């Protein structure tokens, strides 16, 4: 009889920035993992962006399973990042630390974040994303507190009172929502529930995409 | 088949202000539990907060006990707003809105033509120039008007300009939800201090005194809106000179002494009563007979 | 069709003053059951009350006995007024005004041609310099006078001071009621309990010499126009000289002694009967011939 949080349920795929933590790579390939990445493929095709901390290329490889090819960016490829942030590069995925496929492209040292902080053109697009869009985060074992994320959004955008962003996490206690919620609402984001096992993350999120896209399209 | 009270039947659309009460928005639908009463409604706000995993087990059952009392459940909804909305007021939290959105949607899909005819009849008097105000949180009139006949705007008592134009009969865009309307939850004032702030201004109080003297008000479905707090504080306090020109109410006949008790009691408050004693599907048919009579005398 | 008793044509129109009965206001919609015979007025207020919730079915069955236990019927109407209008301090009470308008509404809808001839004739008789008095609450003779282009002044004795002008004959086209007036049912006084309290101004009763010997009455349609004692009380307390009372009544032929007796009583009182072959629409033409003969000899 389960339901999906309605304000996030109103959202239409162009509206969204999908930020992917390690927990989705952990949920993934298993047959339920291929059904998750099938859901990701539909979202990004319908005009969301996908971004990830993760160095893997599971998304680009799953695009080969269902008749597509998807392009990987790293934060040294500032030209393609500008075209991605301007919505022009459809089928382009960002890996924030970079992707294992490009060794010089990987950014980890503070100077890699500072290269984006120096790029006022891409930083203006980063502010613009956070002003315009609603963001959905997944599997936040690092992403919200990530030193790249903290440099890239958190130095750059101060509308932290005025956000309309959502997260998923699998709720085990009152304190787990609260404790998350306090730092999350200081960043500006709101918490949401699923709550039985990691198997709900594929199943819930596939029906969330179905309702988002069937309303939006 | 039934008569119209002739001093009411001969009134015109410019003269009137209508009130719709909670029973109507339920009665339109043969199959909506969640609006049948204030107890059905507060049951569904906890159903949303429970099923979305937004209220904890202890808090849910603690409020459920308080709601079992039947002791002013309308005021227990004030206590639920005090729990739900964070008072670090610069933070525009969504959660209260997300509760309400679960229940106050998928309404129209169930409905029947006799209910739609009631909404069209109400809209015809509003269009022809009546001002409408209502008890309810819902939007059924604004959805039904936006769909097939008018621009309809939903208003709460917080907005000084929009209430001033409503009092001046200018803002014929609007339907006035005295308490507050579910697609604007930040606006909701169940707690007295907000409508008491509308009492404070001397020129606004001239417009309010003028409003109660000038027109005839009709109430529908059940009229208990006379004593649902906000209505009493602004309108009823102003009886400095008890002119009380005719205002009118419908009721369903019951067993006869209940109707008698109401009739006597409200006629001393200032307000006249009329009966029907039939299947509720005839209540929309009766309201068509009254609607034609008023509107054809106006236009 | 047997013509004018030659007493009639002699009288110059400003000498006459008239009173209108039952069958006249019936003939201005004569298939409506509520006027066919005067018990029908209460039959219709009861048949309204069964649906319109003035009284229970058991109070209704008590009045059904009162319909079979007839005579006293005009003070049965006074007792029914005392049932339907005890009062608070002032205001506009729900049971009464807003129930009479089941029977004194929706007459004007049926002002047929044969009926309008009588009211037409009376109206020009008013313009020809008479004064007029009317039994009923009803306003037919006010409305079909504004149709021909004159807006009548209604009089009833609760408008206390205006008799100062009416006995001076100054308020031309003013019509003075008896069983009150439909535009202000508050004015009703069916009984010695009411009307004569105004006539405590005994200069009016003195000038009623000038209004009962120096001038001539004519009475339409009935016999009911005097045979319940109202047309003893408001007039015989001033004067009783049967030699020079100088007044008339229109009637119908029937079985011989049952026609004769009313002529015998009336002629002994000092009022003169006029009689023809019975049928309803002939009275309209009888009255117009009489009016043409009077108004031409008054020209």
CSV table of C-alpha atoms in Angstrom, one decimal, chain A residues 10-188:
chain,number,residue,atom,x,y,z
A,10,UNK,CA,5.1,16.7,-8.8
A,11,UNK,CA,8.6,17.1,-10.3
A,12,UNK,CA,9.1,16.6,-14.1
A,13,UNK,CA,12.4,15.1,-15.4
A,14,UNK,CA,14.0,18.4,-16.8
A,15,UNK,CA,13.5,20.0,-13.4
A,16,UNK,CA,15.8,17.5,-11.7
A,17,UNK,CA,19.6,17.1,-10.9
A,18,UNK,CA,20.3,13.5,-9.9
A,19,UNK,CA,23.3,13.2,-7.6
A,20,UNK,CA,24.5,9.6,-7.2
A,21,UNK,CA,26.5,8.3,-4.2
A,22,UNK,CA,28.2,4.9,-3.6
A,23,UNK,CA,24.9,3.3,-2.4
A,24,UNK,CA,23.5,3.1,-5.9
A,25,UNK,CA,26.6,1.4,-7.2
A,26,UNK,CA,26.2,-0.9,-4.1
A,27,UNK,CA,22.4,-1.5,-5.0
A,28,UNK,CA,23.5,-2.4,-8.6
A,29,UNK,CA,25.2,-6.1,-12.1
A,30,UNK,CA,22.3,-7.9,-10.4
A,31,UNK,CA,18.9,-8.2,-12.3
A,32,UNK,CA,17.4,-5.6,-9.8
A,33,UNK,CA,20.5,-3.5,-10.4
A,34,UNK,CA,19.9,-3.6,-14.2
A,35,UNK,CA,16.2,-2.6,-13.5
A,36,UNK,CA,17.6,0.4,-11.4
A,37,UNK,CA,20.0,1.4,-14.3
A,38,UNK,CA,17.1,1.0,-16.8
A,39,UNK,CA,15.3,3.6,-14.6
A,40,UNK,CA,18.4,5.9,-14.6
A,41,UNK,CA,18.6,5.6,-18.4
A,42,UNK,CA,14.9,6.8,-18.7
A,43,UNK,CA,15.5,9.7,-16.4
A,44,UNK,CA,18.6,11.1,-18.1
A,45,UNK,CA,17.1,10.5,-21.6
A,46,UNK,CA,14.0,12.5,-20.4
A,47,UNK,CA,16.4,15.4,-19.7
A,48,UNK,CA,17.6,15.2,-16.2
A,49,UNK,CA,21.4,15.4,-15.6
A,50,UNK,CA,23.1,12.5,-13.7
A,51,UNK,CA,26.2,13.4,-11.6
A,52,UNK,CA,28.2,11.0,-9.3
A,53,UNK,CA,31.1,11.0,-6.8
A,54,UNK,CA,31.8,7.4,-8.0
A,55,UNK,CA,34.8,6.6,-10.2
A,56,UNK,CA,32.9,3.6,-11.9
A,57,UNK,CA,31.3,3.7,-15.4
A,58,UNK,CA,28.3,1.5,-14.6
A,59,UNK,CA,25.9,4.0,-16.3
A,60,UNK,CA,27.9,4.1,-19.6
A,61,UNK,CA,28.1,0.2,-19.6
A,62,UNK,CA,24.3,-0.1,-18.8
A,63,UNK,CA,23.7,2.3,-21.8
A,64,UNK,CA,25.2,-0.5,-23.9
A,65,UNK,CA,22.6,-3.0,-22.5
A,66,UNK,CA,19.6,-1.0,-23.8
A,67,UNK,CA,20.8,0.6,-27.1
A,68,UNK,CA,22.5,3.9,-26.0
A,69,UNK,CA,26.0,5.5,-25.4
A,70,UNK,CA,26.7,8.0,-22.6
A,71,UNK,CA,29.6,10.4,-22.2
A,72,UNK,CA,31.8,10.7,-19.1
A,73,UNK,CA,33.2,14.1,-17.8
A,74,UNK,CA,35.8,14.9,-15.2
A,75,UNK,CA,36.4,18.4,-13.6
A,76,UNK,CA,39.5,19.1,-15.7
A,77,UNK,CA,37.4,18.9,-18.9
A,78,UNK,CA,35.9,22.4,-18.2
A,79,UNK,CA,34.8,23.0,-21.8
A,80,UNK,CA,32.5,19.9,-21.9
A,81,UNK,CA,31.4,20.7,-18.3
A,82,UNK,CA,30.3,24.2,-19.5
A,83,UNK,CA,28.2,22.5,-22.2
A,84,UNK,CA,26.8,20.0,-19.7
A,85,UNK,CA,25.8,22.7,-17.2
A,86,UNK,CA,24.2,24.7,-20.0
A,87,UNK,CA,22.0,21.6,-20.7
A,88,UNK,CA,23.5,21.3,-24.2
A,89,UNK,CA,25.4,18.0,-23.7
A,90,UNK,CA,22.5,15.5,-23.4
A,91,UNK,CA,23.8,12.0,-22.7
A,92,UNK,CA,26.7,13.5,-20.6
A,93,UNK,CA,27.4,12.2,-17.1
A,94,UNK,CA,29.7,14.0,-14.6
A,95,UNK,CA,32.0,12.0,-12.3
A,96,UNK,CA,32.9,14.7,-9.7
A,97,UNK,CA,36.3,13.2,-8.6
A,98,UNK,CA,36.6,12.1,-12.3
A,99,UNK,CA,36.1,8.6,-13.6
A,100,UNK,CA,38.7,5.7,-13.5
A,101,UNK,CA,38.9,5.7,-17.3
A,102,UNK,CA,40.8,9.1,-17.3
A,103,UNK,CA,43.9,9.2,-14.8
A,104,UNK,CA,45.0,12.9,-15.4
A,105,UNK,CA,41.3,14.0,-15.4
A,106,UNK,CA,40.8,12.7,-11.8
A,107,UNK,CA,40.6,15.5,-9.2
A,108,UNK,CA,41.3,14.8,-5.5
A,109,UNK,CA,43.7,17.4,-4.2
A,110,UNK,CA,42.2,20.9,-3.3
A,111,UNK,CA,43.8,22.4,-6.4
A,112,UNK,CA,41.4,20.4,-8.6
A,113,UNK,CA,38.3,21.9,-6.8
A,114,UNK,CA,40.1,25.3,-7.0
A,115,UNK,CA,40.4,24.9,-10.8
A,116,UNK,CA,36.6,25.0,-10.9
A,117,UNK,CA,36.5,27.8,-8.3
A,118,UNK,CA,38.7,29.8,-10.6
A,119,UNK,CA,36.4,29.0,-13.6
A,120,UNK,CA,33.8,31.8,-13.0
A,121,UNK,CA,32.0,30.7,-16.2
A,122,UNK,CA,31.3,27.2,-14.9
A,123,UNK,CA,30.8,28.5,-11.3
A,124,UNK,CA,28.0,30.8,-12.7
A,125,UNK,CA,26.4,27.7,-14.2
A,126,UNK,CA,26.7,25.9,-10.8
A,127,UNK,CA,24.9,28.8,-9.1
A,128,UNK,CA,22.3,28.8,-11.9
A,129,UNK,CA,21.5,25.0,-11.4
A,130,UNK,CA,21.0,25.4,-7.7
A,131,UNK,CA,18.7,28.5,-8.2
A,132,UNK,CA,16.5,27.0,-11.0
A,133,UNK,CA,16.3,23.2,-10.4
A,134,UNK,CA,15.2,20.7,-7.7
A,135,UNK,CA,18.0,18.2,-6.8
A,136,UNK,CA,17.4,14.5,-5.8
A,137,UNK,CA,20.4,12.9,-4.0
A,138,UNK,CA,20.9,9.1,-3.6
A,139,UNK,CA,22.9,6.9,-1.1
A,140,UNK,CA,24.7,9.7,0.8
A,141,UNK,CA,27.5,7.9,2.6
A,142,UNK,CA,29.7,10.9,1.5
A,143,UNK,CA,28.2,13.2,-1.2
A,144,UNK,CA,26.5,16.0,1.0
A,145,UNK,CA,29.8,16.3,3.1
A,146,UNK,CA,32.2,15.5,0.2
A,147,UNK,CA,35.2,18.0,0.0
A,148,UNK,CA,34.6,18.4,-3.8
A,149,UNK,CA,30.8,19.0,-3.1
A,150,UNK,CA,31.6,21.4,-0.2
A,151,UNK,CA,34.0,23.4,-2.5
A,152,UNK,CA,31.8,23.3,-5.6
A,153,UNK,CA,28.3,24.1,-4.3
A,154,UNK,CA,28.9,25.2,-0.7
A,155,UNK,CA,31.4,28.0,-1.2
A,156,UNK,CA,29.7,29.1,-4.4
A,157,UNK,CA,25.9,29.3,-3.6
A,158,UNK,CA,24.5,31.0,-0.5
A,159,UNK,CA,20.7,30.6,-1.2
A,160,UNK,CA,20.8,27.9,1.5
A,161,UNK,CA,17.4,29.2,3.0
A,162,UNK,CA,15.6,29.1,-0.4
A,163,UNK,CA,16.2,25.4,-1.7
A,164,UNK,CA,13.6,23.0,-2.9
A,165,UNK,CA,15.7,19.8,-3.0
A,166,UNK,CA,15.1,16.2,-1.8
A,167,UNK,CA,17.1,13.1,-0.6
A,168,UNK,CA,16.5,9.4,-0.2
A,169,UNK,CA,17.8,7.4,2.9
A,170,UNK,CA,16.4,4.3,4.5
A,171,UNK,CA,14.9,5.5,7.8
A,172,UNK,CA,15.8,3.4,10.9
A,173,UNK,CA,15.0,5.9,13.7
A,174,UNK,CA,13.6,9.4,14.6
A,175,UNK,CA,17.2,10.5,15.3
A,176,UNK,CA,18.4,9.3,11.9
A,177,UNK,CA,15.9,11.6,10.1
A,178,UNK,CA,16.5,14.5,12.6
A,179,UNK,CA,20.3,14.4,12.6
A,180,UNK,CA,20.4,14.3,8.8
A,181,UNK,CA,17.7,16.9,8.5
A,182,UNK,CA,19.5,19.5,10.7
A,183,UNK,CA,22.7,19.6,8.6
A,184,UNK,CA,20.6,19.0,5.4
A,185,UNK,CA,18.3,22.1,6.1
A,186,UNK,CA,21.4,24.2,6.9
A,187,UNK,CA,22.6,23.2,3.3
A,188,UNK,CA,18.8,23.6,2.3
